[model samples]
Each structure stands twice: as C-alpha cells, then as structure tokens.
Target: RMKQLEDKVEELLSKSYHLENEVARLKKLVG
Candidate 1:
C-alpha cells in the first residue's frame, strides 16, 4: 500500500489546481 501515498499526493495537487482556477475566475469576475 505504499502506492496509496503517491495517489494521495496526486489527489491533493489536482484539487489545489482546481481551487486555484476557481479563485482566478472569481477574481476576474469581481474585477
């Protein structure tokens, strides 16, 4: 189950990327 650690990191980074995109869009809308 050592592979699970890599999977978890990948999931975390993917979500972080999505969150950043959402924040960028919101900023554009507000500005």
Candidate 2:
C-alpha cells in the first residue's frame, strides 16, 4: 500500500511540475 501511494505521489508531482512549467513559460511569454 505504501509503495502504491508513493507511485501516485510521484505521478502527481510530475504532472504538477509540468503544469507549473507551462504556466510559467506562458506568463513569461505574455509579459
């Protein structure tokens, strides 16, 4: 169970990282 939860956390973190990257890039471009 712990291992499964760890994988989910990593997946969410990776997705969030990419989401944040895109947002930052767009903001910079818009500025």
Candidate 3:
C-alpha cells in the first residue's frame, strides 16, 4: 500500500484532440 515516491511530477506534453478520443475509448474498456 503506497503512493509515496509519487513525488514524481507531470509533464504536460501539450494538449491535443488525439488524447481526448483515446481517453474516451479507454473508459469503454473500464465498463
């Protein structure tokens, strides 16, 4: 049980329409 070391950071690799579509597709996989 750990989320530590998550001191990691996020690099906003530029936003794009490509990511949204891919995320929507992933949600389907969850349900």
Candidate 4:
C-alpha cells in the first residue's frame, strides 16, 4: 500500500513538472 502511494506521488510530480514546462513555453511564446 505504501509503495503504491509512493508511485502515485511520483507520477503526479512528473506530470506536474511537464505541465510547468509547458506553461513556461507558452508564457515565452506570448511574451
């Protein structure tokens, strides 16, 4: 159960990182 939770957290963090990068790119494009 703990391992599953850890995996989920990692996945969420990875997704968050990708989203952040995408936002940054968009901001640059808009600027």
Candidate 5:
C-alpha cells in the first residue's frame, strides 16, 4: 500500500518538475 502511494507521488512529482522547467523555459522565450 505504501509502495503504491509512493509510486504515485513519485510520478506526480516528476511531472511537476518537468512542467515547472517547461514553464520557466516558455517564460524566458516570451519575455
């Protein structure tokens, strides 16, 4: 059970990290 939750959190965090980087890149391009 804990492993399942941990896996999901890991996936979400990974996505968030990538998205954050993407947004930052776009901001630099736009401004």
Candidate 6:
C-alpha cells in the first residue's frame, strides 16, 4: 500500500511538472 501511494505521488508530480512547463511556454508566447 505504501509503495502504491508513493508511485501515485510521483505520477502526480510528473504531470504537474509537465503542466507547469506548458503553462510557462504559453505565457511566454502570449507576452
């Protein structure tokens, strides 16, 4: 159970990082 939770957390963080990069790129384009 603990390992599963850790995996899920890592997945979420990876997705968040991707989304952050996308947002930054869009913001730069808009500016």
**TM-score winner among the candidates?**
4
Tens digit of lDDT per residue, candidate 4, span 1-31?
A: 9999999999999999999999999999999
Model 1: per-residue Cα lDDT over 1-31, one tens digit each: 7799999999999999999999999999999
Rank by TM-score, highest first: 4, 6, 1, 5, 2, 3
TM-score for every candidate vs. truth? 0.83, 0.76, 0.46, 0.87, 0.82, 0.85
Clash-forming residue pairs, model 1 = none
Model 5: per-residue Cα lDDT at residue 9: 100
Score each candidate by Cα lDDT.
Answer: 0.98, 0.99, 0.58, 1.00, 1.00, 1.00
lDDT of 1 at 17: 100
Once fitted onto the true fold, the runs of candidate 1 whose alpha carbons sit more than 4 angstroms away are none
Please give, for residues 1-31, the per-residue lDDT of candidate 2 as tens digits: 9999999999999999999999999999999
lDDT of model 2, residue 16: 100
Candidate 3 colliding pairs: none
**Backbone clash count for every predicted candidate, in the order shown:** 0, 0, 0, 0, 0, 0
Stronger candidate by lDDT (1 vs 5): 5
Taking the tens digit of each residue's C-alpha lDDT, what string does model 6 give over 1-30?
999999999999999999999999999999
Candidate 5 — which residues are off by over 4 angstroms?
none
Question: Which 10 successive residues of model 6 have the least lDDT summed?
Answer: 22-31
Clashing pairs in 6: none
Q: Write the per-residue lDDT of candidate 3 for residues 5-30, one digit (tens) a residue.
A: 33332222334456887899999999
Worst 10 residues of 3 by lDDT: 5-14
TM-score of 1: 0.83
Q: Model 3 off-target regions past 4 Å?
A: 1-15
Residues 1-31, candidate 5: write the lDDT tens digits: 9999999999999999999999999999999
